[PDB]
Scaffold this active site. Structure first.
Site, short mmCIF file in Angstrom:
data_model
loop_
_atom_site.label_atom_id
_atom_site.label_comp_id
_atom_site.label_asym_id
_atom_site.label_seq_id
_atom_site.Cartn_x
_atom_site.Cartn_y
_atom_site.Cartn_z
N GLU A 100 0.81 -1.20 0.00
CA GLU A 100 0.00 0.00 0.00
C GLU A 100 0.85 1.26 0.00
O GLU A 100 0.57 2.20 -0.76
CB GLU A 100 -0.94 0.05 1.21
CG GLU A 100 -2.15 -0.87 1.16
CD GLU A 100 -3.09 -0.64 -0.02
OE1 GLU A 100 -3.08 0.46 -0.62
OE2 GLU A 100 -3.86 -1.57 -0.35
N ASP A 156 -6.49 8.48 -0.53
CA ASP A 156 -6.01 7.37 0.31
C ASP A 156 -4.94 7.96 1.23
O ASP A 156 -4.05 8.66 0.76
CB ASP A 156 -5.40 6.26 -0.55
CG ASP A 156 -6.41 5.62 -1.50
OD1 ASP A 156 -7.60 5.53 -1.15
OD2 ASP A 156 -6.00 5.21 -2.59
N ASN A 181 -7.51 10.23 -5.77
CA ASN A 181 -8.18 9.43 -6.78
C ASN A 181 -9.06 10.36 -7.58
O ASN A 181 -10.19 10.63 -7.20
CB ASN A 181 -9.04 8.33 -6.14
CG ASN A 181 -8.21 7.40 -5.26
OD1 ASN A 181 -7.33 6.68 -5.75
ND2 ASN A 181 -8.47 7.43 -3.95
N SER A 204 -11.86 11.01 -4.05
CA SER A 204 -11.45 10.58 -2.71
C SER A 204 -9.92 10.50 -2.64
O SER A 204 -9.25 10.48 -3.67
CB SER A 204 -12.06 9.21 -2.37
OG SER A 204 -11.47 8.17 -3.15
N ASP A 230 -12.94 9.40 -8.52
CA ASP A 230 -14.09 9.60 -7.63
C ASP A 230 -13.94 10.68 -6.57
O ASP A 230 -14.73 10.72 -5.63
CB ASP A 230 -14.50 8.28 -6.96
CG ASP A 230 -13.65 7.95 -5.74
OD1 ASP A 230 -12.44 8.25 -5.73
OD2 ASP A 230 -14.22 7.39 -4.78
N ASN A 260 -8.93 4.92 2.57
CA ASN A 260 -9.73 5.86 1.77
C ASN A 260 -10.72 6.77 2.53
O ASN A 260 -11.44 6.34 3.43
CB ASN A 260 -10.45 5.06 0.67
CG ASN A 260 -11.13 5.96 -0.36
OD1 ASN A 260 -12.32 6.27 -0.24
ND2 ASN A 260 -10.39 6.36 -1.38
#
Length: 130
Positions: free
Chosen positions: A35, A53, A46, A51, A49, A60
């Protein structure tokens, strides 16, 4: 903070992640590795959409933490996403545990399915004294 492998393994163990909801420490290590490369400051926006992380586990913002800029988002871990960018990972751990209390468990992270699931992850904790 960019954790060194074994340093992280012991920190996670101390935090009660070893076998939490049936998830072995090596799985959590494998997850953190893919990750973020064990980096607590890592972030990823991102564009698809809206959002983002956050942290070592790349949690998220759409459902787990609040950053105030993700549309119709939720804050299940009840933390500002900022808390997921600290050197001290206690909050991120609290949040990762919250994540896996849901049905998917460790499967919540697609990178885990891709790089850890059905794989030999023993190498992640080898020699760490955990």
């Amino acid at each position: 903070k960019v954790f060194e492998r074994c340093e992280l393994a012991r920190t996670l163990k101390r935090l009660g992640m070893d076998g939490y909801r049936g998830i072995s420490l090596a799985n959590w290590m494998c997850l953190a590795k893919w990750e973020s490369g064990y980096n607590t400051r890592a972030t990823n926006y991102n564009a698809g959409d809206r959002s983002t992380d956050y942290g070592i586990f790349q949690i998220n913002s759409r459902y787990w933490c609040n950053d105030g800029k993700t549309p119709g988002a939720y804050n299940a871990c009840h933390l500002s996403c900022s808390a997921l960018l600290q050197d001290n990972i206690a909050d991120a751990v609290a949040c990762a545990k919250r994540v896996v209390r849901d049905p998917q468990g460790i499967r919540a992270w697609v990178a885990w399915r891709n790089r850890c699931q059905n794989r030999d992850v023993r190498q992640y904790v080898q020699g760490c004294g955990v």
